[PDB]
Design an enzyme around this catalytic site. Structure first.
Site, short mmCIF file in Angstrom:
data_model
loop_
_atom_site.label_atom_id
_atom_site.label_comp_id
_atom_site.label_asym_id
_atom_site.label_seq_id
_atom_site.Cartn_x
_atom_site.Cartn_y
_atom_site.Cartn_z
N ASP A 24 0.83 -1.24 0.00
CA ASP A 24 0.00 0.00 0.00
C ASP A 24 0.86 1.28 0.00
O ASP A 24 1.39 1.68 1.05
CB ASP A 24 -0.88 -0.01 1.24
CG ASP A 24 -1.88 1.14 1.28
OD1 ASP A 24 -1.98 1.86 0.27
OD2 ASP A 24 -2.61 1.27 2.30
N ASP A 47 -1.14 5.58 -5.52
CA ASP A 47 -1.62 4.80 -4.38
C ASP A 47 -2.02 3.36 -4.79
O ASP A 47 -3.13 3.13 -5.31
CB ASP A 47 -2.85 5.48 -3.74
CG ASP A 47 -3.35 4.72 -2.52
OD1 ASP A 47 -2.72 3.71 -2.10
OD2 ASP A 47 -4.37 5.16 -1.95
C1 LIG Z 1 -3.28 3.23 8.58
O1 LIG Z 1 -4.69 3.22 8.36
C2 LIG Z 1 -5.03 2.87 7.06
C3 LIG Z 1 -6.31 3.18 6.67
C4 LIG Z 1 -6.72 2.88 5.39
C5 LIG Z 1 -5.88 2.27 4.47
C6 LIG Z 1 -6.31 1.93 3.06
C7 LIG Z 1 -6.97 0.58 2.90
C8 LIG Z 1 -7.47 -0.11 3.99
C9 LIG Z 1 -8.08 -1.34 3.85
C10 LIG Z 1 -8.23 -1.89 2.59
C11 LIG Z 1 -7.75 -1.23 1.47
C12 LIG Z 1 -7.96 -1.76 0.12
C13 LIG Z 1 -9.20 -2.30 -0.25
C14 LIG Z 1 -9.46 -2.71 -1.54
C15 LIG Z 1 -8.44 -2.61 -2.45
N1 LIG Z 1 -7.21 -2.14 -2.16
C16 LIG Z 1 -7.02 -1.73 -0.89
C17 LIG Z 1 -7.12 -0.01 1.66
C18 LIG Z 1 -7.32 3.01 2.58
C19 LIG Z 1 -6.81 3.47 1.22
O2 LIG Z 1 -6.77 4.86 0.95
C20 LIG Z 1 -8.09 5.37 0.78
C21 LIG Z 1 -5.40 2.99 1.27
N2 LIG Z 1 -4.47 3.38 0.35
N3 LIG Z 1 -5.13 2.12 2.19
C22 LIG Z 1 -4.61 1.97 4.91
C23 LIG Z 1 -4.16 2.25 6.19
#
Ligand SMILES: COc1ccc([C@@]2(c3cccc(-c4cccnc4)c3)C[C@@H](OC)C(N)=N2)cc1
Length: 372
Positions: A32, A216
């Site tokens: 991520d 992202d």
């Molecule tokens: C540290 O707290 C977080 C909160 C959200 C995320 C997510 C996240 C959380 C859970 C699942 C996903 C996800 C779901 C479906 C497809 N790809 C990723 C993303 C949200 C998204 O930005 C809006 C991102 N880039 N990461 C990551 C860390």
């Protein structure tokens, strides 16, 4: 040994195998670039195949700090600690890192995604609960000789490669074009022009970056600020007008399906995103085909036909170049030189008429600064 170390389901992220603790506990972890925490399931949840068991790790240390993260689409909570972390099909090292053990969550884990935590690869500025919590990659570089760079090759149908510490020339063709990382928080970039089938949207370029633009891997769609989104849907509709689609299609909610192999790709236009170059008023473009922005759904129940979601959606938090944009490019996160490179990937999208491309340079003499 790093090639082909990613897997993924459509719309559900790409993940890498990691281990946590001693003896090592194996977990699949979503890669991520839009967040900065190493956060793993650490208690039972209906959607988790497995989870981190801190009591079985003799190298775990509780940091006695909690973390709570409500975000738009969900929430999670847990406890901060440190433990030994490795990437079996990554660099040949084990490091000590921060780990947020997720103890409660709502709409965070996805049913059937095959991952159990998230590896946030962005910078400390956006770490939770605050910027003092050192992200994984920063610990990796500090504790080893790994160069301060990684690259992602995400492939559609899913799979791909995360290469840490260098660039694998077998994963791209043509030239690598670089855009500056504007600020080290998200991987923030600047879009200087947008065309839809070669037609300039003709907006003040600041609009393209209201209020930031980011790369992202943890968002599925291309997300656009309201004004840009409305303009892009209007142009995509004008180009595809021989066929009319349900309202819900354009809202990214509803499937459109065609009989096997008959998707009319040629009625959908190519989107060109011109990114700021490394020198004043120079840019390069990445081109995005409908094979990227019409995301195929993989559900057995719908498998007789080819069905898609419109993978462009309205944003109120800026432009997000999500996984459907990254797919088919080799994307180099050159943290050492504060830049992101794009090249055509070995798994790039194409048909007989059109191919995803990375092209440059373009010069624009009458350019204001396009950032907010
Ligand atoms: C540290 O707290 C977080 C909160 C959200 C995320 C997510 C996240 C959380 C859970 C699942 C996903 C996800 C779901 C479906 C497809 N790809 C990723 C993303 C949200 C998204 O930005 C809006 C991102 N880039 N990461 C990551 C860390």
């Amino acid at each position: 040994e790093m090639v082909d170390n990613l897997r993924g389901k459509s719309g559900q992220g790409y993940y890498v195998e990691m281990t946590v603790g001693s003896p090592p506990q194996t977990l699949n972890i979503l890669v991520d670039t839009g967040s900065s925490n190493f956060a793993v399931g650490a208690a039972p949840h209906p959607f988790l195949h497995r989870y981190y068991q801190r009591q079985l790790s003799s190298t775990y240390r509780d940091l006695r700090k909690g973390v709570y993260v409500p975000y738009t689409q969900g929430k999670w909570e847990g406890e901060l600690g440190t433990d030994l972390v490795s990437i079996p099909h990554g660099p040949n090292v084990t490091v000590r890192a921060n780990i947020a053990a997720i103890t409660e969550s709502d709409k965070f884990f996805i049913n059937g995604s095959n991952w159990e935590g998230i590896l946030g690869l962005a910078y400390a500025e956006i770490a939770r609960p605050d910027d003092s919590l050192e992200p994984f990659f920063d610990s990796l570089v500090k504790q080893t000789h790994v160069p301060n760079l990684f690259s992602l090759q995400l492939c559609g149908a899913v799979g791909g490669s995360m290469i840490i510490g260098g660039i694998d020339h077998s994963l791209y063709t043509g030239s690598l074009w670089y855009t500056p990382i504007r600020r080290e928080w998200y991987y923030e970039v600047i879009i200087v022009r947008v065309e839809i089938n070669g037609q300039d949207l003709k907006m003040d370029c600041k609009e393209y970056n209201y209020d930031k633009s980011i790369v992202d891997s943890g968002t599925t769609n291309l997300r656009l600020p309201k004004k840009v989104f409305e303009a892009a849907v209007k142009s995509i509709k004008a180009a595809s007008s021989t066929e009319k689609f349900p309202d819900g299609f354009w809202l990214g909610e509803q499937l459109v399906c065609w009989q096997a192999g008959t998707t009319p790709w040629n009625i959908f236009p190519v989107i060109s995103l011109y990114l700021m170059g490394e020198v004043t008023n120079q840019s390069f473009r990445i081109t995005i085909l409908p094979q990227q922005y019409l995301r195929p759904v993989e559900d057995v129940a719908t498998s007789q036909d080819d069905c898609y979601k419109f993978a462009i959606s309205q944003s109120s938090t800026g432009t997000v170049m999500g996984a459907v944009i990254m797919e088919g490019f080799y994307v180099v996160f050159d943290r050492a030189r504060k830049r992101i490179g794009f090249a055509v990937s070995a798994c790039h999208v194409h048909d007989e008429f059109r191919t995803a491309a990375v092209e440059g340079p373009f010069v624009t003499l009458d350019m204001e600064d396009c950032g907010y």
